């Protein structure tokens, strides 16, 4: 029993974190095989700024060992520093681009040293509600499937509302953001509906049923309600994905939608669900199944 | 900016997790140097659990009855001893991945990271607090026994908790790494229950200071309170008493934000009376009590 915001074990990623210094800027790098990946803002016309740099300008430190940079190239908003030594701790890995609503673990780092790990979600507005200070750039987001680390995020900046923006590991930004000091803002955010439903199923599995009702709804009627409360539309794919949780608890997906509609129109009336007075949207259907079954890595 | 429930990076602990099997029971062990630490109830059957005589059950076992697996390698048990509710299995190989470590016993209100494990394999990491009633609100299934709680301030791992059992309300009970239980619990299947729980007042105040540091002041008021008037009100909402130690501990956060501890206590009193009126504090509609004054200073900007 119990339901916590749980991150993946971070050890496979900890063994990849390095410190990257160029001039007065120090940030984090990800060392995989013989390449260190980091935000290109560590060095704007980035091609013009990069051509003026030599390999020895990039100081890379892995623990108490200085790695030697033997090459450098830019891919979108990520800088790839070729080093002479392959990381002996390189895990089995892939670079994957995630979709809004998907969750991942963040290993927050400062000076190439990991300080904490937390779980978060890519918001529908492409920002992440992270916890980062100056020096955290280059910190990464990931998931683990069996023994393979799927790197999905690299931290680049903080927006004026305190939320965060970054790229995939191929340097493509999530969201309409750019890596430069200019007027940028997070767009209006929405709630991840499929994730709220997954969390309601987790609450039922853990013994909370007060919000259940005898009613059902249609996808069309539910989506009219979701639009009114700034909730993302629910698709037939989302309904299909919630199939296993619907079969386990005996509550059809549109039956849980009628519970959610009632919660949106009436509130919680002083009650809580899994220790929360707000509807939680940062657990996917897969996260719920994984935590309620104890999958290991 | 931002404020998350943050766990310590788990790698140093992942390299210590092993699987311990005795008869039909399999659970997790912590391998440090040449010793594997695990709950002593690994020697029990489900029947034995009502009134187990651990000394009598242990004397009947030999070293080869304990199967210890570290990854795909079987370790050899060369000795065994019991210390309180923990079993210490001496092995013939020291863990080459043993980090710098200490065993620390924590007090209620302290936080720690839990590396939840099944069959000696880590499945996830989350942040917990030792509740005032000595239980933890964890997330554990059958097979999670032997999973550990820890803190990693600097490069040293301080092991503070080892998971032993789930109580009927879904909360969890365990020991320090010397095998002493937190609270009045026993590693027996007798009728046991968590006592009435209370809110960790010093942690709620720390979290209100975190909200002020992050730019939120809506909840502040023009009032102050004596410590005794604060405690008389707070006890009516099942909040733990605030002591002069707690007031002293909140000194640095008070100096940084310019809000006196007793002035923040007055704001807490008003929040308990009024509720949040549709507002949130650091993305939460409830008053959060699982961040210590030390956690706030560590995570927040100076
Ligand atoms: O947002 C930024 N940074 C921060 C990142 N994460 C949390 C931060 C928290 C506070 C802070 F002051 C800065 C933070 C540091 C660099 C910087 C400042 O200006 C930039 C412009 C463009 C780009 Cl790509 C990056 C940045
Ligand atoms: O609570 C217990 N266990 C569980 C632990 N953590 C989450 C569990 C979740 C579910 C579950 F069914 C068991 C869990 C497994 C062993 C067991 C069953 O009875 C006991 C009595 C005394 C002691 Cl010391 C231990 C136990
Ligand atoms: Cl303590």
Write the DSSP string, chain A. Answer: ------BPP-HHHHTTEEEEEETTEEEEEEEETTEEEEEGGG---HHHHHHT--GGGSEEEETTEEEPEEEEEEETTEEEEEESS--TT--EEEE----TT-EEEEEEEETTEEEEEEEEE--TTS-B-----TT-TT-EEEEEETTEEEEEEEEEEE-TTS-EEEE-TTSPBSSS--SSSS---PPPP-B-HHHHHHHHHHHHHTT--TT--S----HHHHHHHHHHTTBPPPPHHHHHHTHHHHHHHS--HHHHHHHHHHHHHH--TT--BTTBSS---S--HHHHHHHTTT---
The answer to whether the CB atoms of B139 and A3 lie below 8 A apart is yes
Quick one: B158 and B68 in the same domain? no
Kindly list the residues from chain B whose CB atom is less than 8 angstroms away from the CB atom of residue A296: 117-119, 121-123
- Ligand 2 in reach of B57 Cβ (< 6 A): no
- Identify which of B140, B215, B301 has the shortest CB distance to residue A2: B140
For residue B174, give the ligand nearest its CA. Answer: 2
Find all residues with CB under 8 Å of A267, minimum gap 6, and list them: none
Quick one: A195 and A132 in the same domain? no
In the reported structure, the alpha carbon of residue A158 is separated from the centroid of ligand 1 by a whole-number distance in angstroms of: 5
Q: Is A257 a catalytic residue?
A: no
| C-alpha–C-alpha distance, residues B194 and B190, integer Å | 13
Quick one: B296 and B203 in the same domain? yes
Catalytic residue chosen out of the listed positions B145, B160, B265, B300 = B145
Quick one: A87 and A99 in the same domain? no
| C-alpha–C-alpha distance, residues B198 and B184, integer Å | 16
Quick one: B114 and B188 in the same domain? yes
| C-alpha–C-alpha distance, residues B103 and A279, integer Å | 38
- Identify which of A107, A129, A207 has the shortest CB distance to residue B2: A129
The answer to whether the CB atoms of A276 and B285 lie below 8 A apart is yes
The answer to whether the CB atoms of A114 and B215 lie below 8 A apart is no
Tokens of A268: 């919680």
Q: Counting atoms of ligand 2 from 1, which one is nearest the CA of B143?
A: 15
Domain count, chain B: 3
Tokens of A42: 């560590």
Quick one: A241 and A259 in the same domain? yes
- B101 Cα to chain A: minimum distance (Å): 17
Q: Which residue of A has its CA nearest to B275?
A: A270
Per DSSP, the three-state class of B231 is helix
The answer to whether the CB atoms of B2 and A115 lie below 8 A apart is no
Quick one: A153 and A173 in the same domain? yes
Optimal mutation site among B123, B283, B302, interface A, most CBs of chain A within 10 A:
B123
In which residue are the tokens 């900007």 written? B301
| C-alpha–C-alpha distance, residues B271 and B157, integer Å | 37
Q: Counting atoms of ligand 1 from 1, which one is nearest the CA of A135?
A: 15
Of the candidates A229, A232, A97, the one whose C-alpha atom is nearest the C-alpha of residue A151 is: A97
Tokens of A240: 């299909």
Of the candidates A198, A131, A156, the one whose C-alpha atom is nearest the C-alpha of residue B7 is: A131
For residue A155, give the ligand nearest its CA. Answer: 1
Quick one: B209 and B276 in the same domain? yes
Tokens of A66: 């200085």
- B266 Cα to chain A: minimum distance (Å): 23
- Identify which of A129, A133, A207 has the shortest CB distance to residue B301: A133
| C-alpha–C-alpha distance, residues A138 and A131, integer Å | 14
Handedness of CA B253, B255, B261, B264 (dihedral sign): negative
Technique behind the model: X-ray
Of the three residues A173, A189, A205, the one that is the final residue of a domain is: A189
Q: Give the CATH number, domain containing residue B165.
A: 2.40.10.10
Kindly list the residues from chain B whose CB atom is less than 8 angstroms away from the CB atom of residue A295: 123
Check residue B221 and report its DSSP letter.
Answer: -
Quick one: B235 and B292 in the same domain? yes
Quick one: B187 and B264 in the same domain? no
For residue B114, give the ligand nearest its CA. Answer: 2
Q: Is B273 exposed, middle or buried (0-12, 13-18, 19+ CB in 10 A)?
A: exposed
Of the three residues B197, B215, B238, the one that is the final residue of a domain is: B197
Q: Is B145 a catalytic residue?
A: yes
| Residue A116 phi, psi dihedral angles, 5° rounding | -170, 165
- B16 Cα to chain A: minimum distance (Å): 12
Domain that residue A55 falls in: 15-91
Catalytic residue chosen out of the listed positions B16, B22, B38, B41 = B41
Quick one: A203 and A282 in the same domain? yes
Check residue B142 and report its DSSP letter.
Answer: T
Of the three residues B99, B115, B143, the one that is the final residue of a domain is: B99
The answer to whether the CB atoms of B143 and A294 lie below 8 A apart is yes
In the reported structure, the alpha carbon of residue B59 is separated from the centroid of ligand 1 by a whole-number distance in angstroms of: 62
Q: Which residue of B has its CA nearest to A108?
A: B9
- A140 Cα to chain B: minimum distance (Å): 13
Find all residues with CB under 8 Å of A214, minimum gap 6, and list them: none
In angstroms, this model's resolution equals 1.7
- What residues does A114 pair with on adjacent strands? A109
Quick one: B10 and B152 in the same domain? yes
Q: Which residue of A has its CA nearest to B280?
A: A278
């Amino acid at each position: 029993s119990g339901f916590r915001k749980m991150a993946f074990p971070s050890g496979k990623v900890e063994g990849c974190m390095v410190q990257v210094t160029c001039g007065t800027t120090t940030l984090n790098g990800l060392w995989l095989d013989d390449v260190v990946y980091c935000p290109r803002h560590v060095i704007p016309n980035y091609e013009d700024l990069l051509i003026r740099k030599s390999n020895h300008n990039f100081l890379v430190q892995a623990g108490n060992v200085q790695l030697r940079v033997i090459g450098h190239s830019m891919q979108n908003c990520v800088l790839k520093l070729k080093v002479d030594t392959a990381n002996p701790k390189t895990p089995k890995y892939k670079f994957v681009r995630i979709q809004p609503g998907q969750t991942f673990s963040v290993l927050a780092c400062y000076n190439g040293s990991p300080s904490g790990v937390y779980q978060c979600a890519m918001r529908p507005n492409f920002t992440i509600k992270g916890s980062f200070l100056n020096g955290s750039c280059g910190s990464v987001g990931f998931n683990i499937d069996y023994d393979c680390v799927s790197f999905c995020y690299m931290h680049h900046m903080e927006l004026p509302t305190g939320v965060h923006a970054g790229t995939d590991l191929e340097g493509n930004f999530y969201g309409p953001f750019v890596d430069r000091q200019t007027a940028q803002a997070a767009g209006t955010d929405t709630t991840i509906t499929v994730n709220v439903l997954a969390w309601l199923y987790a609450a039922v599995i853990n013994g909370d049923r007060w919000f259940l009702n005898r009613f059902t709804t249609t996808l069309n009627d539910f989506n009219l309600v979701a639009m009114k409360y700034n909730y993302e539309p629910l698709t037939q794919d989302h309904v299909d994905i919630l199939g296993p949780l619907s079969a386990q608890t005996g509550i059809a997906v549109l039956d849980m939608c009628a519970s959610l509609k009632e919660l949106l129109q009436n509130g919680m009336n002083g009650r809580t669900i899994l220790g929360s007075a707000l509807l939680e949207d940062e657990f996917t259907p897969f996260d719920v199944v994984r935590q309620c079954s104890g999958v290991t890595f």
